[PDB]
Amino acid sequence: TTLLNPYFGEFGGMYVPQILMPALNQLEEAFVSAQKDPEFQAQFADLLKNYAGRPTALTKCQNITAGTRTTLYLKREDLLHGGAHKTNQVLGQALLAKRMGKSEIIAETGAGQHGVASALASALLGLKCRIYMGAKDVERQSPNVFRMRLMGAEVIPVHSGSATLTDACNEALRDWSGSYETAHYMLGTAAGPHPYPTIVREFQRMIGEETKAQILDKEGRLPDAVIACVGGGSNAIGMFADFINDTSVGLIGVEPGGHGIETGEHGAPLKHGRVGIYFGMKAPMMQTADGQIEESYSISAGLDFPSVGPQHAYLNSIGRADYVSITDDEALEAFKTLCRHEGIIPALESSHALAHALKMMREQPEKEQLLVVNLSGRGDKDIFTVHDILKARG
Amino acid sequence: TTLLNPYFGEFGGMYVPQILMPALNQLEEAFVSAQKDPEFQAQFADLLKNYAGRPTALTKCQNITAGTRTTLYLKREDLLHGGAHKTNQVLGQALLAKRMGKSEIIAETGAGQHGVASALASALLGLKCRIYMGAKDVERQSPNVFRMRLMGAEVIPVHSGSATLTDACNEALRDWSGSYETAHYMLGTAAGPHPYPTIVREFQRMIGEETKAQILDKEGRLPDAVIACVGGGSNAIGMFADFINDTSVGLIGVEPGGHGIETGEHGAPLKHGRVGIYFGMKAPMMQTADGQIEESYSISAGLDFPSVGPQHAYLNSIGRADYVSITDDEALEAFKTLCRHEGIIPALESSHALAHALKMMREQPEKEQLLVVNLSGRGDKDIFTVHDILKARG
Amino acid sequence: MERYENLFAQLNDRREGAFVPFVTLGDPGIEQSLKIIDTLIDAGADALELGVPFSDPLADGPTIQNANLRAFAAGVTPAQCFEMLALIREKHPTIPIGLLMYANLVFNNGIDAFYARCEQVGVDSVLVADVPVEESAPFRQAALRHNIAPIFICPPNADDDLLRQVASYGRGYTYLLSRSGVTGAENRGLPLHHLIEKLKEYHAAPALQGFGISSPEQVSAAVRAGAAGAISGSAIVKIIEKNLASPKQMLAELRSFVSAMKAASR
Amino acid sequence: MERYENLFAQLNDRREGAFVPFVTLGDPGIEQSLKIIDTLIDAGADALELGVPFSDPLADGPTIQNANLRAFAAGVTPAQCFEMLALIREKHPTIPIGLLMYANLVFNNGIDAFYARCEQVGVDSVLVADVPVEESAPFRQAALRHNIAPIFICPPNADDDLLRQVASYGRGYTYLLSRSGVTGAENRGLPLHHLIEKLKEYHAAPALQGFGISSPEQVSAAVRAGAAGAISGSAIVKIIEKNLASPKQMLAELRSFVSAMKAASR
């Protein structure tokens, strides 16, 4: 049995081989106990503030919303140590691994930001860490491979399947299923089997909590909507969580549309796939008619995953959150716009969320709205990718 | 005449062609007036907090000082937007250019961090910006070239001379001498003619001010010493300034030793050069016996400059600050050590300061000391350089 | 499920265990696959464990991953596996047939519909690798409604609650996990005598050991320990891989290995 | 400094201005340089402005930067420039000789020692490009002690305080800056008549216009405006650059250009 509900409505669960159930129950118990331990919370807070640099800025864009009644703020997770929001929950999971007595870490990564975060946290806290990365993503996110290597982590390129995030995830779990007495699997997003979706949300909720406190201080009211890109769902649930009971606040999740939904080359199973069971959870999947898990596609490695965390499927199902998609080309234009008009170089992942907020502004420019975009990371890892595209155009 | 003293003892002055004196006096007057304008200070504070992310963390390293009586804190300027301390004073100088009514920006850059900072600030505040970079540094710091380009700035590679920082500086000033009615020259370090050394120090002093407030809160006493790398001198004077009247606090500046002082391939004119007049100031210079300005050398582009700001020459002369050097190999070992044992990838510039604090610890490991290292920037721009070295060794 | 009971009641009257091979269906092609399976049975397989090609076999190491990929290259789909299964049953009326499934293929077009189709083609049991006992309810209920034995894993880290649920819910045979990890002949299997005894105490279905069985010594060991038999999937698929261009010598090398394995169980 | 006064008092008695060429000393070699300078004087130079190769000529555009680099390639050092200067003076006893210096070469071995050496070799004035009037004290004092005219720049953005300091402190000639920017024949020069009048009002030394003078029309313009003359450094060095392999045609092309320039001043 479990201490906490493993499902969000129909979505979620623990679909792993029986061998891994003691590992999941152990982690769940460690989490529940740690959330009650003021000494674990103080240590977590200490790392977040003094090591990662929280709280992050909330930046008001004045140039990009000119001539419109949109006020746009960016939650600056790009300024966090490591360059993205991934760092937040990795500090918490590293403390949990140590609370359990574990000594090794396994992790999967696509945009390499979660791998970088797992490697830096393991180096700080004295854990031996190994990261699985898809050989395609080794290439398109290569600044992060050597960052990982520099920090004492072992990086394992994954040539299976699409050689992207989902293939890394499969090797990660295969490995954990034969390492778990000593290693903790530091899953990088709010997906996978229970308790990961719950843990990852609680270890990222400071995104939404700070945003709430900061907008009230600056604007005296809640935002009309908060907007985040949705890979597995960690930064968006971290932004959403503290607003879920504020029913006036729209929660907008942005899936990668890739080359266009109609092409089939996208990463939007929440709206364009079908519920399936894979990676330990019941959740929307991109899949063939006869149940084979399909390959996803995004220009952004960090969104190039063919499922989504179960809490997002549930928030969608009851109407509490709305999900949309943004294509590669839209995400590229949003990247350029932020660089040239706000002097922030955003991750191509976050650029999807920016691109949707700009669409909300442009489509209805006399509508009064206060929007927050979760700027989930910086785009240094993307500049070569973006270079090669812009040069092939002009 | 001037409103402020242009010299620090014998060092400093305004050694520019007569044509540029009205530009310098204008900037000095604008600065003096702005420092009295609570509305300019509020706007500056607004950008620093909400846009750049100040205050930065003060991180205590527990692993690297183990087995010693050294407590080492790192002032995390690497977490600032843009990736280094350069961003602080560029926001102030951008506000000054706008206060003056200027509309274009000129800047020079070596490690490309100041160019990146000038480009992002110009994009945010609506200024047209052009940056001169040495063609050698274009190469060894290439992640920053396209960052600059992405943000709407014009980047001009400098093949003259050593094709490094000092050659960029010469083109910058040549250009300003024929653009100054419309462009403001946003000099990137605490050197050059008055008023730049003073302005750059006051626009970086929040480094030392925050460090003072943070160490008193965490340790209840001032540090025994603060340690910073010294290119032109901006991050070190920003760290030092608020401690100068705390005479118990040691102020340690670290020049690049390059391949070894005895090789002549270094960037340490403060201790190993001779006073000269160049780049608009009287300051220690590396130069030939007959007065030609010599070429400097550092593994770190950001320290590869053959002079130093005049306030550092003065603090040295009266004994208030001490200056030392750290070789390429020492700086490389400090880079590796921070990556593997604290999970922070530091700029090769800052690694020089880290390397000296580690020497202070290792040489006298039973000495009780509280040290702060100015972590002037992150090392993402350096990972390729460092890769190619470590691979050529093993 | 009544084929397993009939088997074990005759295996024991002959003082031997069961040797159950595993292969992927359609590896390396539909029609060579069938002659592999006919050759396993004629060589002495007591029952079969049969995998349906799946896009993400997360309990399987590279040997069986490659089996899966070979079947995909052959164009082998689940619907073609079920026509294969019908031909195997129509050739082999008493041989128990178990499937190794992943949850998504069972859930894809309806859990009940999947088990309805298993019954239609004559499958005797279904093991769903990524479904623990905690999530097993709809799988075990649909299996029982269509007379399919739901196979449960007894792991080496089994506590007592697990033993008693597996014992009560399982039919056909209880799966004795040799070790942690994924399938592979590379990693050989802690002694499992104690779990075997507890399972018998609680009227579990009879126990077969799997994961890592690669040599005749391993097989006799498990029946020596009071288990009912052993399963070997890889070291069997590697014989298949070894002879991709050698179909004739593939089958002879298989036949040799199998009652080499089966004899060890007598 | 008394050579400049003697000159201007005879230029004016002949109703003409002065044409003062600039070259880098030792560009493109010591001994070709001397024959350039002898050729400038025989072609009609009234005085000379002579640059000493410096590692960072920040008031100079690419033409003269390249002049500097050519002299460095020739191995030309300051000490060799001063032996050149002595030979030029010993050939040309009445031609005023001014140096264009950068501050570091003057300060390197002692400000007073630099001006002592200028006097020893017969230099008449020194202009230090990166020393404004605000930092000029030790330079102007050492110059006056060794009978060297300190040359001050009157810029086009000159306010009144500047005019009156330049007027009082300067000797020899006042330098009339044509424009902002760095040296170059590329950028041609705002009319400067007004500054000329104020300078005369305050007993300034006589005024020569420089920075951008490239054509005979430009030269007659400046003397037309009541100035005393014009300086052309580039468009002269480019003739030098043009004919690196053509030393003979270098000098003829120079001679042609110069009293082409000088005549425009009559």
Ligand SMILES: O=P(O)(O)OCCNS(=O)(=O)c1ccc(OC(F)(F)F)cc1
């Ligand atoms: O000989 P090997 O190493 O290839 O191991 C035998 C594997 N063949 S199988 O169908 O029994 C088999 C049995 C259980 C599996 O997963 C689970 F344990 F999680 F349920 C997967 C495959």
Ligand SMILES: O=P(O)(O)OCCNS(=O)(=O)c1ccc(OC(F)(F)F)cc1
């Ligand atoms: O013909 P050009 O364009 O080459 O201009 C003439 C330049 N030759 S020079 O020695 O008089 C000369 C004069 C002044 C200079 O700098 C200063 F104005 F800042 F003082 C530099 C060179």
Ligand SMILES: C=C(/N=C/c1c(COP(=O)(O)O)cnc(C)c1O)C(=O)O
């Ligand atoms: C998959 C990865 N990146 C995820 C990511 C994402 C998508 O992951 P989540 O949906 O869990 O936030 C969004 N933004 C940034 C900057 C990201 O790096 C990874 O680093 O492995």
Ligand SMILES: C=C(/N=C/c1c(COP(=O)(O)O)cnc(C)c1O)C(=O)O
């Ligand atoms: C010269 C540059 N860099 C300077 C630098 C320095 C040296 O500059 P200052 O001495 O002015 O701080 C130190 N640390 C970092 C991260 C730096 O980028 C430049 O970006 O152009």
Ligand SMILES: [Cl-]
């Ligand atoms: Cl519960």
Ligand SMILES: [Cl-]
């Ligand atoms: Cl349910």
Ligand SMILES: [Cl-]
């Ligand atoms: Cl809590």
Ligand SMILES: [Cl-]
């Ligand atoms: Cl294990």
Ligand SMILES: [Cl-]
């Ligand atoms: Cl609150």
Ligand SMILES: [Cl-]
């Ligand atoms: Cl690039």
Ligand SMILES: [Cl-]
């Ligand atoms: Cl003063």
Ligand SMILES: [Cl-]
């Ligand atoms: Cl002085």
Ligand SMILES: [Cl-]
């Ligand atoms: Cl102030």
Ligand SMILES: [Cl-]
């Ligand atoms: Cl101008």
Ligand SMILES: [Cl-]
């Ligand atoms: Cl205070």
Ligand SMILES: [Cl-]
């Ligand atoms: Cl690399």
